[PDB]
Amino acid sequence: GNPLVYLDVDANGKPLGRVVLELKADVVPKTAENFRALCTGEKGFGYKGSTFHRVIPSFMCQAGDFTNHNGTGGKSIYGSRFPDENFTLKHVGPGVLSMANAGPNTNGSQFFICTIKTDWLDGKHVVFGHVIEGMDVVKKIESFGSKSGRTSKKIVITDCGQLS
Numbered sequence: 001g002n003p004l005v006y007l008d009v010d011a012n013g014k015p016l017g018r019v020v021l022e023l024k025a026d027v028v029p030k031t032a033e034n035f036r037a038l039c040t041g042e043k044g045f046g047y048k049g050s051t052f053h054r055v056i057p058s059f060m061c062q063a064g065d066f067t068n069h070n071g072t073g074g075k076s077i078y079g080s081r082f083p084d085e086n087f088t089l090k091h092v093g094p095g096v097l098s099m100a101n102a103g104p105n106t107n108g109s110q111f112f113i114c115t116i117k118t119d120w121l122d123g124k125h126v127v128f129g130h131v132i133e134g135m136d137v138v139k140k141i142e143s144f145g146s147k148s149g150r151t152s153k154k155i156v157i158t159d160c161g162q163l164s
């Protein structure tokens with residue numbers, strides 16, 4: 001059924017633990033598959049060694065720019081960008097996993113994990129998964145953010161892959 005993938009996260013070289021995510025391939029197969037392949041690194045590129053570059057407490061933690069490392073870059077397994085698959089899943093609460101974008105139909109590799117219900121993003125960002133285990137690790141990441149999004153520690157995805 002749905003893939004389970006993981007992100008192991010460090011803050012200034014000290015391990016925070018693991019985040020496990022279910023990808024909703026039953027609802028958004030193209031979006032799920034992109035994220036899965038970027039966790040395994042099987043196309044020759046992916047999230048390993050990239051950072052959470054924008055973290056805003058009581059909102060979300062954002063990551064996945066492995067080309068420019070600053071929120072301008074990243075790419076998908078299909079090309080630079082790919083379309084909004086559908087908006088069937090909603091931002092219902094903490095732990096929701098959703099695609100970052102620069103407007104309609106600009107999905108790449110950047111993603112965010114919500115730390116509250118972000119209902120005003122419904123219809124604008126494609127929801128494609130949720131946190132199964134490791135919300136404590138996410139709350140730690142959140143604690144290193146600020147209003148501007150700047151992080152007070154370097155937060156690195158030191159390893160990632162597929163569990164099933």
Ligand SMILES: CCOC(=O)CNC(=O)NCc1ccc(N)cc1
Nearest residue numbers: 071072100101102106107108110112
């Ligand atoms: C809570 C979600 O906040 C955003 O997504 C704000 N946008 C954002 O950082 N946009 C930069 C960006 C550039 C290229 C791609 N592919 C994706 C994103």
